[PDB]
């Protein structure tokens, strides 16, 4: 029953020491949680044998260089079981020490409740929101193939220094989350041979026994996708685990899924196989009882036998040696491929090739009205050729997002090629399907895996579908790029389910997400330029683009875009010491109203400054000297214009300012009717400027 | 090719029916050609199916679209709105030919995507892919639970409350994560009366689906536990109708029917392409199509009299079905006077006498109590008195306090577990780790009938369910989202879990009321107001703390119901004496407001404390009330909230202060976090002082 599943099956090399190492994992987890009084001990206990096998034996990595280019990557998607990762990091010499384990979940420690990228050496990604790690792992896998395309394409299956695996530990919760279905469905399409996922199937979650909400045959589901699926029984069946792993490595045309049936919190006599093992301290009695069962001293805590540590720390030496062997192959590769090596070096130093931005498109103020999205495609098409690290695509909307670099092929197995798209393994164009959330997660995987630069595209509205991934990117401060088109009622007839209203405010609220909304075709070009150049740091970016055509304007300025907000034209106006009478601040498709109203106000002896604000976050990060030059605090008469809610503009316009906004849902009609009906006209901007003064 | 587009007409089918079908196709083609944008393709290929469902399959009355006993239909592929419109028209539901001629124009009854309440017989707003299907699930669940309340002892199929939910889904719906989650939980709950067609048609916006979709969708459905069947060809009405009766025969598994189809049949050049999906065919293709079907290529919106006469028979059929049904209902009413009284109470949106008589109270100064604990206490107290109130949690019942004490669980008894006994007419919902599906399901429930469902998860994960939440607000229906662990207050789980931008981001959604009780009593008053429907009929997100908070002096039911009210008046005041300063706070930060009020009096500063549990309710109150609470002559204002500042600027104005958190948190206990991030009475007091000196 409970006894059948928790029976050991140790391989031939496995000594008493290995059994002690495992037992050490289990008690360290129980003690670590007991110390702080809250945490997640149960899963760490049952997964000890698996985690042990992965770090000590399965994976290629070097504990003295967690940045080693050629390392296998591990992702703990079940982020609650952070101790699983922390203890291997400690046991194997990765940088964590016993005192870090003893600091679980305390202010500023290297071991927070969920693992954080950059806080701890050896953590490949922040996880915790369930689904995210698995879905991102898919991205990592995809990136490794694309990175292979760029550095060593002609190498043979397995023979490249750039060949490695992505290992993922997922739980029931990961398996239930929609994002995982999406990412898995697409992983199969892309035949990601080097992705190997363990699913800890343990019939437990926070509401205890999973039967109350989970009846599916997950393994069959994965077979349905086109994954390589295996079922292994029992947490202690290291033999079963190791055979599954080798079977998976041998399959190179399908990502692998190994469902491992387990009893949570083994061997806690009373608490195992319960929800309580998942998310609370076991209590002193259950901890003592566990120590007795494994032959540990129930009166001491954080006990680590010298022989155990001496053994596990052998990974340091094994790692070093693997790294030294790998180095010869790499060095050989560098001599054989000086060109591609120079690229690798350019990408790792985060530099761009000379004159990469020389073909940058330009449009003349007054020329034909051009949609900011069409401008983006043109800019992408121009920079493509000059930036091999740039790839990306769309969530089934390539036509509408303008994300296909002109004359680029598609990323995928040739057997997925269609009439419209030719797929090569080292292709450039990404097709995510109608999978925005997985798209988001994938993009974080891509830039976490390596130095490539990927972007993903969909309608602004569906930033709602991918929100948890965007948030996580910002938390991680990594440089993903989300192309969001059809940014307002401007989109017209598709109606209120599609038209964004709250979206810019809600996105601007996310600490560290830069929301970039170019006023016209040239601001667009200057935007990409600033994004790729990394002028404003290394956080995520949402690039907001219109469906409908907008004027090409006078007064646009690269340097000004890169500053976030700048003066598009003062009113003439003007004299030294000549503040303007009123400041109009606008963004994206509403800057043209600011301008036209500046004309209507001069014709009435009112002198208006127009400020284009393509990125409020970049503006706010500029020093006060610059900000007060653009928005002098002595001018209180201010008007903001944006086809979105007022919420995020109040601090900027102050007590006596006005905001021309949309506070309600839209309607199914053409854009011109919509902007008119909702009062997005030069006259309304003018009239607000006038009230701004009284 | 094609044998796919080959007809298979049953034995009753006449020439007329073939004309009826053909009319659907051209009506669709013209209807899009007129306005010059839209989605014609699918509406053409789905014609036979749509025709069969409304004309024949469904039990409904086209002159009472509110008929209690009607089969419900959901077109989850919202873009093919014409498929629903044309059947509404053809079958006498209220739409006329002029409505069809008004597709996608300002204020017409036929917007781009169907809109609940805008058109008679649209059951739900759809358009964001996945939403309709996921909610259909919720509808199915509602019907079961509604049967429990009205006619439980009736026999399988013998109830007037027994009917079906039909759902048309497309490739995009099938790809979307929310669909997976919903489907998976649909099988768990064994929703015998839910029957879904999936238009498997190898086409989406990026042309041929092979570029991003290789899975065997039908297998995947078998894996869940679903009664699956495959039918081949858009024209195979016989296949379709047998599939239909097979599905109705199976009463313990939700049924799924993959229909394989050629998009935009019979458009000679545009069928089977992405261009048939989402643009106007053009004049030639339209012409060509009429020729192929024997229609005048020079006349538009042509509807033969014998066609319409035939299709309109549905009015007559619908009438008699409604009449036969009435006898059973009336029989049922005589047989069940008590349950009829409930149905009547519920339809009139009434609450039983003394329903809020047991409402919990707590004395100011008593043991610190967490606002989530207060919620469960309240829920427990009202459960017995309100049969229509059900719901549960996204695998966090223990942590959300959503189980009504002494309640049973909703599901087949065979999913029962040690912790939860499931009955068919059980009350406690177990969504598992599927927040998005949870959101869509709550919308299904309250759309389907007059029951009142709530759903629970951590505030953080409103991110996972955002597109469902937003769609609820767009429809203005009275869903309820219990969001617990509202801030850094949640402690050691860390920055992936701690909400920062969420209150602001959620407040930004037009029509979502974000209710954050200050203490256990406010919590009780909040529920009272939500269930009373005092503030209208839209969605509510109820924000609750993980950690204990003081029971405060000056809480007031009437004030909560108003959204924002005066909690205390500084001690020094005279009549017509404004306070020196106003402290406005919410939820767990009100205690700081108070405690800084004491520190400010001890310094001869007279401060008003305003609790603002719901800013949207406060904003909806007349200015007389608002100015009574927040007199415009007092500029010296301070807001306090453990979230971002964004939503608070308009309220505190130019010279006010905001005590906010502008960055991500940290993994430590809650007291350390509030201290480190400046959430103390002193910091509130110091900010009051600066405001005065501005
Ligand atoms: C999207 C999301 N929803 C909810 C949570 C809260 N949560 C953390 S772990 C968990 C379920 C635990 O079950 P399982 O995934 O089986 O992990 P186990 O305890 O077996 O290792 C939940 C609901 C979360 N982190 N992310
Ligand atoms: C969540 C979401 N993402 C994207 C869209 C935009 N969109 C509308 S339909 C569609 C895909 C069209 O293909 P499919 O659903 O298979 O419809 P078909 O052409 O077969 O009728 C997309 C991406 C949407 N409406 N909702
Ligand atoms: Mg589990
Ligand atoms: Mg399709």
Residue numbers in the entry:
A (entry chain A): 6 to 699
B (entry chain C): 7 to 700
From the paper:
2 mM TPP, 5 mM β-mercaptoethanol (pH 7.4). model, built using Swiss-Model and the TKT structure from E. corresponds to amino acids 490–507 in this enzyme.
non-oxidative branch of the PPP, has been identified in M. TKT enzyme (Rv1449) can convert sedoheptulose-7-phosphate to D-ribose-5-phosphate. mass of 70–75 kDa, with the homodimer being the active entity.
